[PDB]
Write a protein that binds this ligand. Structure first.
Ligand code: HEM
Ligand code: HEM
Ligand code: HEM
Ligand code: HEM
Ligand SMILES: [Zn+2]
Ligand SMILES: [Zn+2]
Lengths: 102, 102, 100, 102
């Protein structure tokens, strides 16, 4: 694996596995991180995955510095842009590969 | 495919295709960009792939800004650090995947 | 100056100076790279500057690899994502500075 | 303000502000982040700022993931290469500009 994927996995385990363990979605059926769901929901481009991660979507909190208002955003520390870039890259790679173990 | 692999492919097709088209090595045997040869030669980490690309190695010219001496380095445009970073990522990932078309 | 500014300037002097010398606009009045024009045209943020540079806007050619269609895009080589990032950074910096 | 300076400010306010608030230096005289001191100490290029941040210097710990030896490096969380790049950019810019606000 590459350094970017390794870092992506580390960030994912820190920030995302509460709701998306093994690529799933414990809150919203049909909105997993697998390719078919990403496509159905219009979040299949890496750019859109970044946007969803930064700003949030529906009941998902955004993680970006400038996510707003605070109720739409993570209770925890905001992630840096580069971290969100790596997370979007990780989700795109994982979806392309059918979610190999992280 | 991720954006990073697309970006790396663009760079690879410009800078590396002279000797390493399709992951091979036209100059000498046993030094392709396939896993077995990277492992054989001890150039199997992104850090080392970066180093070889930056500074050169034997009959391979270096592409880094501070590649020296001149004789060991490309006489074309030198690549930026981020470009070589992308190239190291590209080679590592492509080696892992057995060099599929991008 | 920083490495990013230096690289941004190098890229600008190759790809942009023809139409935007000293932050101006040789084709379109009211659409210079100065702060007030950028704001008036809704190209206020660095993210929007990147979008415009990548995809183009009318007689402004797009420089990104996926700019489309061809007639909307530079006739020269497409610029890399990182290059367009540096260009948006350069233009934002220069606009903030008032193009000295 | 550019995105990069904002990203650098965020990192600075987490890792550096405790000793270098306002571009100063609380530990010892004559080693602030102002141009005059950077030039005097030979830490005036962006590359040298990066190196000092990564590896440390005198009483300053290094923050790089691969900083050595152990005693010259932070015992707290280490920074990623991209974070140190943004920090070096931030310091170089702020020094060039005479440490204006934000
Ligand atoms: C961790 C930083 C994190 C990432 C990365 C992430 C990504 C992500 C994507 C790409 C989607 C779109 C899925 C689709 O099929 O359309 C998505 C959607 C939802 N998420 Fe998420 N998500 C991360 C973090 C979290 C956390 C910690 C939670 C739980 C609190 C969470 C929840 C959700 C929910 C709900 C959705 C569905 C949104 C909708 O379309 O209604 N996410 N996430
Ligand atoms: C393009 C910038 C480029 C990259 C990237 C690249 C990578 C690379 C690697 C990772 C190796 C190690 C391979 C191994 O099995 O050990 C490697 C090695 C050699 N290369 Fe290369 N290389 C790039 C560019 C070029 C070009 C343009 C040439 C031809 C002039 C070239 C040639 C070689 C040679 C020879 C080696 C073997 C070096 C040695 O072990 O002595 N490379 N390259
Ligand atoms: C070089 C890569 C380049 C950059 C960078 C760039 C930027 C840019 C911006 C940010 C705008 C918006 C300005 C505003 O006030 O709204 C803008 C607009 C126009 N440009 Fe441009 N541009 C670059 C390259 C070029 C080149 C080479 C030309 C000339 C062929 C050109 C022209 C124009 C035109 C016309 C506009 C106005 C678009 C509109 O609002 O109708 N640009 N550019
Ligand atoms: C935050 C990660 C951080 C940065 C960035 C940073 C930079 C930095 C530079 C560029 C210098 C050179 C200054 C000069 O005038 O030559 C420098 C020097 C020192 N610093 Fe630093 N530094 C960061 C973090 C910290 C922290 C958290 C402390 C306090 C524990 C600290 C202290 C020092 C000291 C002491 C020096 C002087 C080194 C020397 O020349 O002997 N730094 N720093
Ligand atoms: Zn990557
Ligand atoms: Zn920058």
């Amino acid at each position: 694996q590459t350094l970017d994927i390794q870092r992506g996995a580390t960030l994912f385990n820190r920030a995302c596995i509460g709701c998306h363990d093994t690529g799933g979605n414990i809150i919203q059926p049909g909105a997993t991180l697998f390719t078919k769901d990403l496509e159905r929901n219009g979040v299949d481009t890496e750019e859109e995955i970044y946007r969803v991660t930064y700003f949030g979507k529906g009941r998902m909190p955004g993680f970006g510095e400038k996510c707003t208002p605070r109720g739409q955003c993570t209770f925890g520390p905001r992630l840096q842009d580069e971290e969100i870039k790596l997370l979007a890259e990780f989700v795109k790679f994982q979806a392309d590969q059918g979610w190999p173990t992280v």
